[PDB]
Amino acid sequence: MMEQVCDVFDIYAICACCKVESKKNEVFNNYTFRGLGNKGVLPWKCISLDMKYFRAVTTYVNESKYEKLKYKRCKYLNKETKKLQNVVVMGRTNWESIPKKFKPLSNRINVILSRTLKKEDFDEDVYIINKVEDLIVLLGKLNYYKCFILGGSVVYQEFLEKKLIKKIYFTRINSTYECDVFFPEINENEYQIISVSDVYTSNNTTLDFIIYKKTNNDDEEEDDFVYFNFNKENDFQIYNSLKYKYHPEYQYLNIIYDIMMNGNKQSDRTGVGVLSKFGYIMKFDLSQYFPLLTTKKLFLRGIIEELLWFIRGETNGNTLLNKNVRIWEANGTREFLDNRKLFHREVNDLGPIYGFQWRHFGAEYTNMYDNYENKGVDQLKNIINLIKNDPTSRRILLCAWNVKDLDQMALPPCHILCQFYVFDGKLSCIMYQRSCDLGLGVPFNIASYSIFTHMIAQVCNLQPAQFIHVLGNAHVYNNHIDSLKIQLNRIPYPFPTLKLNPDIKNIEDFTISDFTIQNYVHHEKISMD
Amino acid sequence: MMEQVCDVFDIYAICACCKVENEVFNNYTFRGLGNKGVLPWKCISLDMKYFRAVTTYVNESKYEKLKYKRCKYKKLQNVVVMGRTNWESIPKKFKPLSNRINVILSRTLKKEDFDEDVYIINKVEDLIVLLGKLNYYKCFILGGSVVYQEFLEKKLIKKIYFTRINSTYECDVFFPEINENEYQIISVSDVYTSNNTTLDFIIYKKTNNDDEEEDDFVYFNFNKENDFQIYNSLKYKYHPEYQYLNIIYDIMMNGNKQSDRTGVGVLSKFGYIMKFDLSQYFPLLTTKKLFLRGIIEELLWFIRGETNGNTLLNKNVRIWEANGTREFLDNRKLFHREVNDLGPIYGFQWRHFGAEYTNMYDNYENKGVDQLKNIINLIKNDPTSRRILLCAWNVKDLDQMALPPCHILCQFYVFDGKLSCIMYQRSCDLGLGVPFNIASYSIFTHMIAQVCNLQPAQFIHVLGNAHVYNNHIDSLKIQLNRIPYPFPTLKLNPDIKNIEDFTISDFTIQNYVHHEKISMD
Numbered sequence A: 001m002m003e004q005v006c007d008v009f010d011i012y013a014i015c016a017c018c019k020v021e022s023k024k025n026e027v028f029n030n031y032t033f034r035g036l037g038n039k040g041v042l043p044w045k046c047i048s049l050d051m052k053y054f055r056a057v058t059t060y061v062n063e064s065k066y067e068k069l070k071y072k073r074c075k076y077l078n079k080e081t082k083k084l085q086n087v088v089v090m091g092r093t094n095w096e097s098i099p100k101k102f103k104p105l106s107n108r109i110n111v112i113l114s115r116t117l118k119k120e121d122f123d124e125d126v127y128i129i130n131k132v133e134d135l136i137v138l139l140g141k142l143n144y145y146k147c148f149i150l151g152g153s154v155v156y157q158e159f160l161e162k163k164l165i166k167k168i169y170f171t172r173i174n175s176t177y178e179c180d181v182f183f184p185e186i187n188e189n190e191y192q193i194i195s196v197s198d199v200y201t202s203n204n205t206t207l208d209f210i211i212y213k214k215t216n217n218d219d220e221e222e223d224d225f226v227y228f229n230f231n232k233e234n235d236f237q238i239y240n241s242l243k244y245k246y247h248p249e250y251q252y253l254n255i256i257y258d259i260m261m262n263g264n265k266q267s268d269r270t271g272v273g274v275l276s277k278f279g280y281i282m283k284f285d286l287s288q289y290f291p292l293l294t295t296k297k298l299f300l301r302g303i304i305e306e307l308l309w310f311i312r313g314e315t316n317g318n319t320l321l322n323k324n325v326r327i328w329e330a331n332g333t334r335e336f337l338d339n340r341k342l343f344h345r346e347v348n349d350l351g352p353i354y355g356f357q358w359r360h361f362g363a364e365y366t367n368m369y370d371n372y373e374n375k376g377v378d379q380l381k382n383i384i385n386l387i388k389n390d391p392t393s394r395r396i397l398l399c400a401w402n403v404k405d406l407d408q409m410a411l412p413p414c415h416i417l418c419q420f421y422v423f424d425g426k427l428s429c430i431m432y433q434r435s436c437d438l439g440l441g442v443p444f445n446i447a448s449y450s451i452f453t454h455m456i457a458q459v460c461n462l463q464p465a466q467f468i469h470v471l472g473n474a475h476v477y478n479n480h481i482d483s484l485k486i487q488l489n490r491i492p493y494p495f496p497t498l499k500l501n502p503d504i505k506n507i508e509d510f511t512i513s514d515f516t517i518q519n520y521v522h523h524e525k526i527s528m529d
Numbered sequence B: 001m002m003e004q005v006c007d008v009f010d011i012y013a014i015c016a017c018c019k020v021e022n023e024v025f026n027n028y029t030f031r032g033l034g035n036k037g038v039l040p041w042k043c044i045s046l047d048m049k050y051f052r053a054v055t056t057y058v059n060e061s062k063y064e065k066l067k068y069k070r071c072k073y074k075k076l077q078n079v080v081v082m083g084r085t086n087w088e089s090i091p092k093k094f095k096p097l098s099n100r101i102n103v104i105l106s107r108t109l110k111k112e113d114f115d116e117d118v119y120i121i122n123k124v125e126d127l128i129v130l131l132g133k134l135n136y137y138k139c140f141i142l143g144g145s146v147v148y149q150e151f152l153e154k155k156l157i158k159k160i161y162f163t164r165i166n167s168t169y170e171c172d173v174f175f176p177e178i179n180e181n182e183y184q185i186i187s188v189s190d191v192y193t194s195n196n197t198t199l200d201f202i203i204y205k206k207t208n209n210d211d212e213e214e215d216d217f218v219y220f221n222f223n224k225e226n227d228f229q230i231y232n233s234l235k236y237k238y239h240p241e242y243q244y245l246n247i248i249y250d251i252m253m254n255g256n257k258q259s260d261r262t263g264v265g266v267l268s269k270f271g272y273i274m275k276f277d278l279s280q281y282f283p284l285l286t287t288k289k290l291f292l293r294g295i296i297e298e299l300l301w302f303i304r305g306e307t308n309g310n311t312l313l314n315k316n317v318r319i320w321e322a323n324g325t326r327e328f329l330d331n332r333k334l335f336h337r338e339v340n341d342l343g344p345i346y347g348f349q350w351r352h353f354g355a356e357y358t359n360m361y362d363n364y365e366n367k368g369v370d371q372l373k374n375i376i377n378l379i380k381n382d383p384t385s386r387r388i389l390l391c392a393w394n395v396k397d398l399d400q401m402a403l404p405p406c407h408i409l410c411q412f413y414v415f416d417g418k419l420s421c422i423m424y425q426r427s428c429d430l431g432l433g434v435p436f437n438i439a440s441y442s443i444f445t446h447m448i449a450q451v452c453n454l455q456p457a458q459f460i461h462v463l464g465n466a467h468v469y470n471n472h473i474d475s476l477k478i479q480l481n482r483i484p485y486p487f488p489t490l491k492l493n494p495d496i497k498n499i500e501d502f503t504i505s506d507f508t509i510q511n512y513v514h515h516e517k518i519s520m521d
């Protein structure tokens, strides 16, 4: 049949939404991001990246695309056939919140909705309209590329109600501010997310940009591509329905996907069996976000305590258990130690694992209570020294794989080494991981080495840049498959941030209350079994 | 002015050429077309699969524009043009070629044979008239040396789809020398192994002598910020050597300027990965000449557990020379170390990790951890282990080494009779060291695979601090504008069944085609 008005006239909404104030265990969904305005203005001071994106989207035209849009509009209306511009439509209140120096919005055809004001009341080159229908009539008369509904709660509400919106360009501002007006609850039957962007920081908040779409209910050289592909040989509907998956959480999600679809079926030490592949790299920009997975719920207390226990050079499992952190519990039982032929090892004496190697590489391990002060190589101090005093060194490495002591460890380390890189007052870190449990271990391990990059950067007067995560044997356990099918069909939220107490200037001086995660928005806890 | 015949009728050549019976190499090296009135080689499956696929493909919803142009000047198919000898060359199982408009070009052939679809022609220009009379997608020449010779003299060819067969055969007929001024290469494919040869697919191009979500792409890039003319002029650079060259290109464009320990200065970035498929090729760079005797001897000297630099020096392998001098060792504060006693470096750590180092002459038999044997046992007896690692980075021993290792560790992976290897490298001199390093650990992966009765799969090379020295910049500009040749292969003596038994003569590099040596200095 004859198609609808949003399509012919290319009418979109663009908005920015923050999180809203209503005061441990809270539930997040798309509706979490809904705050539009407060007391006639925006809830926040300035978010310049959203303003830059807004400007980019609302001013962009493709001239060679116009001809086809022209024909289409003419055809729909039964008709023969300055620089091209977009139309922008604002509510009256919206129009009045904008400072005069910015009105009318440059390089766009401005249009205000109003009953109480008429063309006489405006000095500016703008079109006044008093009915939504009158917008449509105008779009028939104007030459323009696209039409963006710039907002106002009232304006948004009515355009979505009359189904005049083809795509919503929606910015998720990942912070909380006092709000009095709200974006309307979007119906999932009517609109689905098709694109999610990278995550960014601007003005002390993370944000991303997503695109909702209205639901389904040269010439020679492109042939050369098909030639070069001559030798190419249901569970992820949502995951596969996304056009642009640029959120960095997709680095992790794409690897699971790849292991699930193309991984090798293998037995393993545990007896569970896995799907495995060999050799991946992920990169997280810590200047922009803290990459805590949002597709399921993670907590950070344990892994921080673990890291503090590493830095103190400890190998005593009782220390963790006494803080109700059980990450190493299974690896310290009588039964487990005896299976490792460690019959003369005390329960929870984990042997010369991470802490011991970081502080005392090469010392003879005795028992977990011994005093090892000044024995072996204090690699941790050495790397901090090298970062401060020879930042361009290519030898800044922290290594836990001590070949000589492997058999005395409760189990050999998975996280083999850290290599550090300094440029322009910024610290980056590569961690190489020999064995990577994708469903359970990896999300924690990303968090751990991201925290440790921040710690090391701070005590060295640098800013953290990239955590780069190298996976050797990357594997999905079979008892994890169904849980990860659920996970890969969840859409990430903008990442949270990590704040460290800025007064901590030595690696040893950190305690648990020196760390806070801010603005963690996540899907529900999944049990992997 | 008035646009050209081949630009209208879409006339393409498609060949496969081999090499023919201290040499310099060029594109002309691959020119071997035919012999005895047949193909030089027994059968090259993959190229045949490529051949079919290229010449049978049509995009129907793109004929409309091609119809438009050819007039202005059921079952849509392609014109395949062949000469008489070539038509006679094919057995009649396949004749006339499946799904295509077979057209034979013979100034003698008795026209009135099977004349439903076989279209004989006697003159040269008669084809372009017969193309006008037809509903065809693209026109392919596959003729023979002379059929090729003429269509090229006549400038009728738009693109050459050229398969480079990387082996040497007896030939009597040859593809004409393509003129560098008149055709340039625009695309280069992955490298493959088919029927005991490597090959790749290149494309010469004639030198001029719902877009809703397309906008969303532009929206997502709102926040983005002639030295490489030939490099940049390629559309499709799929040859695996581009993993190496792209990394150089990247460091060059976006690297960070840094001082280093040496005083030369570098452009550096942090963290890359390259992957080479050893089942298909030996990844010995072809954009400059590389030698391998030295690096093999080094690997043999590693496997023996040696730390004596004199052993290499006496074989005229000077890789470790500069690190064994009196001045170098003293700069390391190794005032009590004999010249060329490199300390507990790779060999020592692979066979004796954790033993006490005394001097290069001592006997360390059964001292320390023999990692090399452990990883061989693990690979043979526990191949799904996730612990198969060989680590040279011994923290206790670093200061005793002439220098700390660049190649931190290898990790091994086994599935389906196949061995892969990751080597992590903390420090990567892109211009000089990395090319040897790829080769060295590739060979080592072959070595370990063989003695464990496995087949090599991937070598995977992870780069920490990756840097281009400033003194290499100009040499690398020249290198990045050279187009790779299909890779050689490595043959190991199959009799060798233990890691300790290889010697220098057990290794053969075959069909190494390369550009001219570059001196990086």
Ligand SMILES: NC(=O)c1ccc[n+]([C@@H]2O[C@H](COP(=O)([O-])OP(=O)(O)OC[C@H]3O[C@@H](n4cnc5c(N)ncnc54)[C@H](OP(=O)(O)O)[C@@H]3O)[C@@H](O)[C@H]2O)c1
Binding pocket: A014, A015, A016, A017, A035, A036, A037, A038, A039, A040, A041, A042, A090, A091, A092, A093, A094, A095, A097, A113, A114, A115, A116, A117, A129, A130, A131, A132, A150, A151, A152, A153, A154, A155, A156, A158, A181
């Ligand atoms: N964060 C974002 O993405 C975003 C975007 C835009 C605006 N804002 C914020 O949102 C708030 C404004 O929202 P709001 O809902 O209160 O006001 P609004 O939607 O901007 O304006 C509503 C007014 O526009 C006129 N109007 C609306 N629909 C009409 C129709 N069909 N026909 C005729 N006139 C019509 C009426 O004007 P009269 O009163 O003149 O009759 C009405 O009172 C402010 O806080 C602003 O800062 C936020």
Ligand SMILES: NC(=O)c1ccc[n+]([C@@H]2O[C@H](COP(=O)([O-])OP(=O)(O)OC[C@H]3O[C@@H](n4cnc5c(N)ncnc54)[C@H](OP(=O)(O)O)[C@@H]3O)[C@@H](O)[C@H]2O)c1
Binding pocket: B014, B015, B016, B017, B032, B033, B034, B035, B036, B037, B038, B039, B082, B083, B084, B085, B086, B087, B089, B105, B106, B107, B108, B109, B121, B122, B123, B124, B142, B143, B144, B145, B146, B147, B148, B150, B173
């Ligand atoms: N690897 C590859 O790319 C490839 C592909 C195909 C074939 N080949 C090989 O190449 C060899 C054949 O090469 P070739 O050049 O000697 O033979 P060819 O080009 O296949 O055939 C030559 C014949 O075509 C006819 N012909 C040539 N020019 C003509 C013109 N201007 N007008 C009309 N007819 C013309 C002549 O037949 P009459 O004068 O007798 O009528 C001539 O004897 C074979 O060994 C074959 O295996 C290689």
Ligand SMILES: CCc1nc(N)nc(N)c1OCCCOc1cccc(-c2c(N)nc(N)nc2CC)c1
Binding pocket: A014, A015, A016, A042, A050, A051, A054, A094, A097, A098, A099, A102, A105, A149, A150, A151, A169, A170, A171
């Ligand atoms: C918040 C920006 C935004 N972002 C997304 N993604 N969608 C929207 N509809 C949107 O608002 C559109 C309403 C516009 O509001 C104001 C309110 C006060 C000031 C300014 C403002 C500013 N300070 N400097 C510049 N140069 N120009 C403007 C006008 C665009 C804008």
Ligand SMILES: CCc1nc(N)nc(N)c1OCCCOc1cccc(-c2c(N)nc(N)nc2CC)c1
Binding pocket: B014, B015, B016, B039, B044, B047, B048, B051, B086, B089, B090, B091, B094, B097, B141, B142, B143, B161, B163
């Ligand atoms: C080397 C093949 C080749 N490759 C590139 N790239 N271009 C060429 N023009 C070309 O020659 C193509 C000319 C004709 O060749 C022959 C010669 C003998 C046998 C067969 C042959 C075969 N044996 N089995 C199958 N099933 N089907 C065919 C015919 C397609 C092909």
Ligand SMILES: O=c1ccn([C@H]2C[C@H](O)[C@@H](COP(=O)(O)O)O2)c(=O)[nH]1
Binding pocket: A269, A411, A412, A414, A415, A435, A436, A437, A438, A440, A441, A442, A445, B385, B386, B387
């Ligand atoms: O921080 C950790 C610790 C362990 N593992 C996983 C990887 C393996 O599934 C298992 C260790 O088994 P081996 O690879 O050591 O066999 O634990 C992680 O992913 N991260």
Ligand SMILES: O=c1ccn([C@H]2C[C@H](O)[C@@H](COP(=O)(O)O)O2)c(=O)[nH]1
Binding pocket: A394, A395, B261, B403, B404, B406, B427, B428, B429, B430, B432, B433, B434, B437
């Ligand atoms: O096999 C090797 C050995 C050395 N290097 C280079 C990397 C550095 O440029 C230099 C070692 O210097 P440090 O990074 O150790 O300072 O040698 C390689 O690329 N490959």
